[PDB]
Design a protein around this ligand. Structure first.
Ligand SMILES: O=C(NCCc1ccncc1)NC1CCCCC1
Ligand SMILES: [Cl-]
Ligand SMILES: [Cl-]
Length: 182
């Protein structure tokens, strides 16, 4: 009851409506994206520096690294919200790559509504160091957005973009979108 048609605005880039949200996928470097929130896929200690998290932490800067460790030594966090540092965003949300991906995405969406944010950019959460399977990750990300729309929760959020390091993972996301199209 929610999905539009899959189309391609540029070479290797794909989009479809899910209710009121435009869902987009593309392969590339997530550290040169602009969005209200950029998501980092990290460890349960919020200090992973390998793969996409290496790139995010080095570009964001030592003040963001400091924010992560400061917050990690206060309570048991499922995820952590920091400033964007020298990334082009208002906040970074650091999620645990090994956690349930649907749950992690649902939390990001809810935190973005709380701040009246309109745009989100995320990696293929959990497919790096955590070694979750790409089609299970794609299914979980898109399911989280469907549930958020079904509940009438999308108000400020208008665009959700997955920027994916490996082209082979981009191909898996495309196939999952085609399976759902209306
Ligand atoms: O894939 C890589 N490095 C490739 C370079 C790269 C990766 C991501 N973002 C920018 C540059 N390392 C992997 C990460 C997962 C754990 C085992 C090492
Ligand atoms: Cl990725
Ligand atoms: Cl990961």
């Amino acid at each position: 009851m929610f999905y539009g048609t899959v189309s391609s605005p540029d070479s290797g880039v794909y989009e479809m409506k899910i209710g009121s949200i435009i869902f987009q996928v593309a392969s590339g470097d997530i550290t040169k994206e602009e969005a209200d929130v950029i998501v980092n896929s990290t460890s349960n200690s919020f200090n992973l520096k390998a793969g996409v998290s290496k790139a995010i932490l080095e570009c964001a800067g030592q003040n963001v690294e400091r924010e992560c460790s400061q917050q990690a030594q206060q309570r048991k966090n499922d995820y952590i919200i920091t400033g964007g540092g020298f990334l082009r965003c208002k906040n970074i949300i650091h999620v645990i790559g090994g956690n349930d991906v649907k749950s992690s995405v649902s939390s990001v969406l809810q935190e973005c509504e709380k701040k009246n944010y309109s745009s989100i950019c995320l990696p293929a959460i959990g497919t790096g160091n955590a070694k979750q399977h790409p089609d299970k990750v794609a299914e979980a990300i898109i399911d989280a957005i469907e549930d958020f729309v079904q509940k009438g929760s999308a108000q400020s959020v208008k665009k959700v973009k997955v920027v994916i390091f490996l082209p082979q993972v981009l191909d898996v996301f495309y196939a999952n979108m085609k399976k759902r199209e209306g």
